[PDB]
Amino acid sequence: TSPVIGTPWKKLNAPVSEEALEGVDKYWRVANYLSIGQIYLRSNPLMKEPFTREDVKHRLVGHWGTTPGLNFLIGHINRFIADHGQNTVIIMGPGHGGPAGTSQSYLDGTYTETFPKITKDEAGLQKFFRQFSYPGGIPSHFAPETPGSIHEGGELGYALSHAYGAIMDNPSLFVPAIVGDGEAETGPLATGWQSNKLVNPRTDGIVLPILHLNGYKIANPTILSRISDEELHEFFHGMGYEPYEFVAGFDDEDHMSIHRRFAELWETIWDEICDIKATAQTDNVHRPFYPMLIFRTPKGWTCPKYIDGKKTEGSWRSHQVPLASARDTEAHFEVLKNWLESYKPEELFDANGAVKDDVLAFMPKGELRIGANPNANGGVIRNDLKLPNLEDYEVKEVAEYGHGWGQLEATRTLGAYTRDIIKNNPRDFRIFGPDETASNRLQASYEVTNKQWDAGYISDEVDEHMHVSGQVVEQLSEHQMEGFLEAYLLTGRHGIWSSYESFVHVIDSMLNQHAKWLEATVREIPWRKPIASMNLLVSSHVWRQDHNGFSHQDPGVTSVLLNKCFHNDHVIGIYFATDANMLLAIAEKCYKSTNKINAIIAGKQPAATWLTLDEARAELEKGAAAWDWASTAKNNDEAEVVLAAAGDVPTQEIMAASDKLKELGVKFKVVNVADLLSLQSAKENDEALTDEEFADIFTADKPVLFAYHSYAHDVRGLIYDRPNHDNFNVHGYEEEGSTTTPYDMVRVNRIDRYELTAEALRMIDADKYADKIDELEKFRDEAFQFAVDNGYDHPDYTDWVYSGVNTDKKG
């Protein structure tokens, strides 16, 4: 569970000291200096004679405009953390203000502690200016390479979903979530405001949304800055916030006056948050209006007002760099020099080039520092789940009635297993669902917890399995469910979410961003300890969206995940739940795993169980296994065709083909693939089957009929250097189907049992088998026509049970 840190939710009951405000002004000035320094200077960090164009970097890379805003807020939060003892994690929505985040870590000690080459002196300061956005150095964004970051803010939108995910089951945590006014125009951000009706002020922590209303994005004004202030206040009140507005920097107000006004406001907001936390110990069933801050300041605040006659402070022109070159001319250099000097850095550094003690007297210390809080390195907090014994959930009927038994919905097994995981691991595991948890059959969870809901209740006849506190959360937003969970994993907890397969694509770019976070982490951030895996149950899949139709038929998250399977990072897993027992096998593996995105493709429709838990655990360890109990060939040399499947529905259609081939006395091998990446090039992936193991399973020379769950392109591109790759006949989804019958969905994509039988005969001998093939094709047309006439499927398709099932026995 989340640890309690410091003294949470304490009022100051005293005004902020003048001496501490002086510290903030100094932090502000030095953080600006270090920010400009990282963008502009390759050398000579303290500007000692001779200070020249040779000291400036050749290409300017990085973003000023947001940075002085961020540096002002982070200074005042640091003051706040130290005076109060508050467990604080920030979310920098504008992750392109990465200089503010590196500056914070350098000034709080965590940078030097983590990178000992980057010392607190002139030499270290020069290394630090240089390395920013620089070949062999560090990113331009608040990247995972930065102490205090759980949010890079490269792809904008996820500021508020991440903030709200971080505070769940984290009642000591406070998250000032800084949101760009451009980022507020994105869809994911717009709906993230609404998260305040899915958290509880007693069992969850608190988010203080801060709107960085600097008036501009790259090249345009922001919508929220150019509407009336009355509209802006109403909008935030209507979304269940008590909005406060701070305006500064548009006039001649002295910097100390601004600091006084801001600390006074901030303490007022904090007093209101402390009243909320205090009330919540008594009454947590009444949703309060959570404070939020509208921070209205000119973009690029404290850069030159005009440069070469164009307004730069309080404009979009300050967004990247207000001054496009300091090398090209002397007058441009003159502006950089005067700009850096306006911060009077002779008052901020000692003669060693260390920051003076009175610039940092006010800073927090130890684990309260933004860079050091374990919430921002959640791996240090994370423990292994207490897993119940997998064998308790095994479908046993396979062991006694035979392979292919039953009409079970596989996901109900993951449902029961996950339920007991929540019971044994309370406050450490969450399920998220875009109004689909029960549709994907995971509602066994409601037996030990509730959907968490902090909007209105009206009636026991409709408000079932909801409570103001609980470990299932639903909102109809794939962005919120991915967001919440990601932050939940990043602050050191566990969980899963499910989605209908086609709508996973809604959050393809979040999967990309979270993969990239994990890629950089496992490659070059050994101090960032492993977090729990992002477990995604991909259900209600293409082959059984016959009832919703073509809009819902897109299994291609598989193709998108394959684009993050490089470098032996091993941050992606892609599993095909053959049946409920293989679903358990995959669930154990993913629930124990760390630093991954696990995509678990599994059907909720009634389907046969093929494997015992033992056979499934064994098949999963290698990724593909031959099925000697289903093969009629005794070894590879006797086999005329290999039948291979990846996916519950292709396994079903391949095993019903197998039975038709057995009755014609064909000699076939049956292969099953649970782990897509097992087939990847052994040159590319050191966990894949070797060519030796590949050749043995799939044979070196015999024709392979491969029925794949998703698009053939996936498998064909994976196996390009494998033995016998030219003999793979891959069937998959081909952008066909409609509102139709289960048989029609497989038929129209040329993966039904009859076409697979036909295909197997074609591959052995078209001439020898020409007759049976024609019979098989006419039956396909006949089976379709049966559906059109009757409105359900042919009994050959419906009433089929694998020959291996002892159906004599009344079970």
Ligand X SMILES: Cc1ncc(C[n+]2csc(CCOP(=O)(O)OP(=O)(O)O)c2C)c(N)n1
**Which chain residues interact with ligand X by CB under 6 A?**
65-66, 94, 96, 155-157, 180-183, 186, 212, 214, 216-218, 222, 299, 319, 434-435, 476, 500, 503, 506
| Partner that binds at residue 740, options Ca ion, ligand X, a second copy, none, CB closer than 5 to 8 Å by kind | a second copy
Binding site for succinate: what residues are annotated? 63, 319, 439, 604
* Residues in contact with 230: Cβ distance below 8 Å, sequence separation at least 6, in sequence order: none
H/E stretch holding 783 reads helix 753-790
* Least distance from ligand X to the Cβ atom of residue 803, Å: 39
| Partner that binds at residue 103, options Ca ion, ligand X, a second copy, none, CB closer than 5 to 8 Å by kind | none
Report if residue 227 touches a second copy, rule: CB under 8 A: yes
Q: Which two tokens stand for residue 801?
A: 């049970």
d(C-alpha 171, C-alpha 167), whole Å: 7
Report if residue 703 touches a second copy, rule: CB under 8 A: no
> Which of the stretches 205-213, 216-224, 614-622, 754-762 binds a second copy when contact is defined by CB under 8 A?
216-224
> Which of the stretches 135-143, 211-219, 445-453, 583-591 binds Ca ion when contact is defined by CB under 5 A?
211-219
> Which of the stretches 457-465, 624-632, 656-664, 755-763 binds a second copy when contact is defined by CB under 8 A?
457-465
H/E stretch holding 27 reads helix 18-40
- Binding residue for a second copy, selected from 185, 245, 691, 796, defined by CB under 8 A: 185
Helices (H) and strands (E) in the chain, counts: 24, 22
State which of positions 541-560 bind a second copy (CB under 8 A): 547-554, 556, 559-560
State which of positions 155-184 bind Ca ion (CB under 5 A): 180-182
| Partner that binds at residue 463, options a second copy, Ca ion, ligand X, none, CB closer than 5 to 8 Å by kind | a second copy
Q: Among residues 118 and 601, whose Cβ is nearest to ligand X?
A: 601
Q: Looking at residue 552, what DSSP letter applies?
A: G
Q: Is 724 left (phi over 0), alpha (psi -120 to 50) or beta?
A: left
**Angle subtended by helix axes 18-40 and 98-108, to nearest 10:** 120
Pairing of strands 606-609, 405-409: antiparallel
Q: Among residues 223 and 664, whose Cβ is nearest to ligand X?
A: 223
Q: By rule CB under 8 A, what string of x and - marks binding of each residue 44-83 to a second copy?
A: -------------xxx-x----------------------
Q: By rule CB under 8 A, what string of x and - marks binding of each residue 423-452 to a second copy?
A: ------------xxxxx-----------x-
Q: Among residues 180 and 345, whose Cβ is nearest to Ca ion?
A: 180
* Least distance from ligand X to the Cβ atom of residue 180, Å: 2
d(C-alpha 6, C-alpha 236), whole Å: 31
Binding site for phosphoenolpyruvate: what residues are annotated? 63, 439, 441, 500, 547-548, 604
| Partner that binds at residue 598, options ligand X, Ca ion, a second copy, none, CB closer than 5 to 8 Å by kind | none
Q: Which two tokens stand for residue 753?
A: 């049992």
496: nearest Cα among 506, 507, 485: 485
DSSP letter for each residue of 580-628: HHHHHHHHHHHHH-BS-EEEEE---SEEEE---HHHHHHHHHHSEEE-T
* Least distance from a second copy to the Cβ atom of residue 224, Å: 8
Other CB atoms within 10 Å distance of the CB of residue 107: 25
Alpha helices in 391-469 (DSSP H): 397-401, 411-424
State which of positions 739-768 bind a second copy (CB under 8 A): 739-741, 744
* Least distance from ligand X to the Cβ atom of residue 97, Å: 7
Report if residue 13 touches a second copy, rule: CB under 8 A: no
Number of chain positions touching a second copy (CB under 8 A): 137
Report if residue 308 touches a second copy, rule: CB under 8 A: no
* Residues in contact with 17: Cβ distance below 8 Å, sequence separation at least 6, in sequence order: none
State which of positions 122-181 bind a second copy (CB under 8 A): 130, 133-141, 143, 152, 154-157
33: nearest Cα among 331, 303, 248: 303
Q: Looking at residue 564, what DSSP letter applies?
A: G
Report if residue 596 touches a second copy, rule: CB under 8 A: no
Report if residue 469 touches a second copy, rule: CB under 8 A: no
562 and 410 Cβ atoms separated by less than 8 Å: no
d(C-alpha 59, C-alpha 63), whole Å: 13
> Which of the stretches 145-153, 209-217, 406-414, 517-525 binds Ca ion when contact is defined by CB under 5 A?
209-217
- Binding residue for a second copy, selected from 238, 252, 357, 526, defined by CB under 8 A: 238
d(C-alpha 487, C-alpha 76), whole Å: 24
Query: Does the N-terminal peptide bond of residue 50 adopt cis geometry, omega within 30 degrees of 0?
Result: yes
> Which of the stretches 561-569, 579-587, 626-634, 763-771 binds a second copy when contact is defined by CB under 8 A?
561-569
* Residues in contact with 564: Cβ distance below 8 Å, sequence separation at least 6, in sequence order: 511, 512, 515, 516, 519, 571, 572, 597
